[PDB]
Symmetry: C2
Subunit: 132 residues, 2 copies
Amino acid sequence: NSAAIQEMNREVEAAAKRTSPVFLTGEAGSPFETVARYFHKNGTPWVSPARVEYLIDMPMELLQKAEGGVLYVGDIAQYSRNIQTGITFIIGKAERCRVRVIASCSYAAGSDSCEEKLAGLFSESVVRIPPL
Amino acid sequence: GNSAAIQEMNREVEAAAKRTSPVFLTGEAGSPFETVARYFHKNGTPWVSPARVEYLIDMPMELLQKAEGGVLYVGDIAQYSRNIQTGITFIIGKAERCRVRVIASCSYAAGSDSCEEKLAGLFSESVVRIPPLS
């Protein structure tokens, strides 16, 4: 309903149009799962690992379970660099397996560097050239 | 050369040097985009740049072939049409398997004044920000 919710809903419409990962960001305690679910289509898989270690131990099993659906990897704010690297492996295979990868990243209220974690999962690099 | 804003810029360059995915350079009109893009060039590998912008939609495989093991520098996208931008996306999606690294720039009017819509269109994910509730 809000004006902030309006803009957000614009970001989810732009996202709806693609097959690449969606990254949800917001304050600790945000409704991450309900927004992630806006990308779920009825009668397709919605897979979320029962345990975090599954992201590195059984990435292929999760991609298979999730075929034509979504692999929701959860909130990365407290994931180790290892799991983060696991997610990158899953990201680079998901298209082929026809899985859409969704991740969240929560941060402390008061906008407290999810950005370092997200930049590592993003599939490109940005370098900003200052004025001379 | 030297300053504190550069120092950071060079942080962004080093983090980028560590990867095979695209690199996107952003900065004001008249930035040395090409000299910075060239920091990712390794000696003896191809440095390929389309002589014509339309080559990006007309002959994407030819450019990827020329650039194998090197870089395809696609140029400054600030005034590229939606079509060309979609051409770059097609090229981005094949570059890895062809062992080509894609580099793009986007320039904006001085000041620091929607490069962001072009770039986010060539970015290989989407970000949705959930505002505070309660």
